[PDB]
Design a binder for this molecule. Structure first.
Ligand SMILES: *S(=O)(=O)c1cccc(Oc2ccc(-n3c(=O)[nH]c4c(NCC)cc(F)cc43)cc2)c1
Ligand SMILES: *S(=O)(=O)c1cccc(Oc2ccc(-n3c(=O)[nH]c4c(NCC)cc(F)cc43)cc2)c1
Ligand SMILES: CC(C)c1ccc(COc2ccc(CC(=O)NCCN)cc2Cl)cc1
Ligand SMILES: CC(C)c1ccc(COc2ccc(CC(=O)NCCN)cc2Cl)cc1
Lengths: 357, 357
């Protein structure tokens, strides 16, 4: 596919959070955003479409991958229409926004579509550790790509519609408020289905300014998604491990701001999980087989954290409880898109040194 | 080297903690231990000597590696003398114990010898990430091998000298007491050099038996080494981050016992460290360049944890503090030696898919 072949030769250009802010500083930048995105979106679409073809034919020929592939092909064709059009024509700029909304909505069902493909592979070829490693590698990259493409589309369509927040970015995101929002939603669900919910305790440590409420530049909807998913797991674990107790331990959150990290630790006393099992919570193949369908899930939550050079880590004490830490870059200049790229370095990934008794 | 070549074709036989207990249950088992070790020690020596030869010549020909290689060669020659001797002769059994003590003492300086080699490589060839990955891979395996060989020697020489503890194993190790022993030693040093020390707070969660003090089968000297090293770092961090404070936060320890894990979490409020840097604490190349020379160090502490299928993990909140968790197998049947083996799976280890702005 030569049109895929053309754009796949470029690599995506990852943007900083600071660079996103300067793209939405004014509605005059719409021409600049249009000329940027009409090249960059085909580059990002084509790079991931080329990686999808590295999948073995027995994966490539399943209906769910063909369906998703057909969406990317169409989305790419929609965009490369605008490659010769005139940015000084306000009809070109509005038809471009229209086309971006259509592309976003066309791809809305990708997550359950790919999940259905994982389910099929488990039953048509099995769930061995080597298959699992390839699924992890591919889906982490495919979903991060998808997050980055939605980010670009959201920043354009939200800003140039026709300002404190800048599209999906809040330059003064109050982290503790997003924590409380996510807790409140999870509590609402947990009270409904379990007739009980732990309370919340929040503390902040602003190391450099001990009195200042902690703010940052971030995408608050991503931070909400991660926190909501963590709260859901921590509340269900706390309730189910205390069936015979009257007091529910609270869920505790510490928000810390350092020179480089902004860290959010959540802590439960919900009984914990053995170290040998805990990483299964981030495995796409484990995660496929009440509160089940309310959030994005733990694998995707960690990708949201990684998208701007952060991370999401779990560590548990079996018999006691579990902690989760969201790590975010404290500086907007360090908050840069983490994007997959297709080359031969990725090409060879797709292609017994300890003793046993 | 054919004598190396012979034994390197066998793979080490990792033993369980339960299997160690049955080897020291009686002093009549000395013949059994002798016939076992006179085969097993050459197997373990030869396997790691073969791996040392996979090192490039520019590493192999440095004085420190030649020195260590000369010790293993001699130790191997000492042992394979006993291959034809009669186990029913009590003179053979005592000369064997004598030979094991000599071999142990001959190898006593291996850690600073190999550290000197790392220092030389950094200055004669540099510290790039690829060199670092090979150093990590090799030294983790070389040191775990060395720990396993010392374990076997200790179990023989301590038991068949001429019983609650079984050589270096305590079948009723009171974990909180070893925690306090290690804390007390670190406090003694910290008071001496810093004129101050945090206090200790310990709690236990015995999930299955809430009133029972937590005991396990383990090697208490290994557990002491890890705890001592962690306490040293946590105390120095707490004191140095509170130069201008009057109150020192305590160091907190939770000991939890689950169905599969026994976990020991230590917590400090010593200011923390950014996520991007924390793994350098386990890097041999970082770790080479007061309390400096009192413990075994963090890399080796984690290997002690891994030796019987455990782990040692750090997680920090920059601007606040740091936690460490030692994870141990709760069941003596799950506590099995983690041994490196030399084959082609290890042979190929010695032999750019994300975007940058
Ligand atoms: S399966 O039986 O092999 C299996 C493997 C791994 C995990 C599980 O089940 C779980 C699910 C969820 C949790 N869990 C908690 O108990 N607490 C959390 C938290 N807490 C945030 C503070 C976050 C989280 F993502 C998961 C959690 C444990 C075991 C079954
Ligand atoms: S260097 O400047 O690049 C660098 C990289 C990584 C780490 C450091 O310096 C340290 C050393 C030690 C610690 N540290 C703590 O502050 N607390 C601990 C603990 N606590 C146990 C509860 C354990 C530990 F192993 C190390 C600790 C932080 C930074 C410099
Ligand atoms: C549905 C989607 C998410 C999905 C489902 C299933 C898979 C499975 O993907 C595999 C499985 C095995 C191998 C090894 C292999 O055969 N290598 C080539 C050997 N010649 C490679 C890949 Cl990419 C991926 C993605
Ligand atoms: C002193 C000891 C601990 C020490 C010091 C230094 C080292 C460095 O070891 C290296 C460095 C680079 C490479 C890549 C390479 O060259 N591969 C082969 C390419 N033909 C492999 C190894 Cl094993 C190891 C151990």
């Amino acid at each position: 596919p030569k049109y895929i072949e053309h754009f796949s030769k470029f690599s995506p250009s990852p943007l900083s959070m600071k660079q996103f802010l300067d793209f939405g500083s004014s509605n005059a930048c719409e021409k600049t955003s249009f000329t940027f995105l009409r090249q960059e979106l085909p580059v990002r679409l084509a790079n991931i479409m080329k990686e999808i073809n590295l999948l073995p034919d027995r994966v490539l020929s399943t209906p769910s991958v063909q369906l998703v592939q057909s969406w990317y092909v169409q989305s790419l064709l929609d965009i490369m229409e605008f490659l010769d059009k005139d940015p000084e024509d306000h009809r070109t700029l509005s038809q471009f926004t229209d086309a971006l909304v259509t592309i976003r909505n066309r791809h809305n069902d990708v997550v359950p579509t790919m999940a259905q493909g994982v389910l099929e592979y488990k039953d048509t070829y099995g769930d061995d550790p080597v298959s699992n490693q390839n699924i992890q590698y591919f889906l982490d990259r495919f979903y991060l790509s998808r997050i980055s493409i939605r980010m670009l589309i959201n920043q354009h369509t939200l800003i140039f519609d026709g300002p404190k927040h800048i599209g999906s970015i809040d330059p003064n995101c109050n982290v503790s408020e997003v924590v409380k929002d996510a807790y409140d939603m999870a509590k609402l669900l947990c009270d409904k289905y379990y007739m009980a919910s732990p309370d919340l305790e929040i503390q902040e440590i602003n190391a450099a300014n001990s009195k200042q409420p902690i703010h940052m530049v971030y995408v608050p909807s991503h931070l909400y998604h991660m926190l909501f998913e963590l709260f859901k797991n921590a509340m269900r674990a706390t309730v189910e491990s205390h069936e015979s107790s009257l007091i529910l331990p609270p869920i505790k959150v510490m928000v810390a701001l350092g020179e480089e990290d902004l860290s959010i630790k959540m802590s439960d006393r919900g009984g914990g999980v053995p170290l040998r099992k805990i990483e299964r919570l981030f495995s796409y193949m484990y995660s496929t087989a009440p509160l089940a369908g309310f959030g994005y899930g733990l694998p995707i939550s960690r990708l949201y954290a990684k998208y701007f050079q952060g991370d999401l880590q779990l560590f548990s004490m079996e018999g006691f409880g579990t902690d989760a830490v969201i790590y975010l870059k404290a500086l907007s200049t360090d908050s840069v898109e983490r994007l997959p790229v297709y080359n031969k370095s990725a090409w060879r990934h797709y292609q017994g040194d300890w003793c046993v008794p």
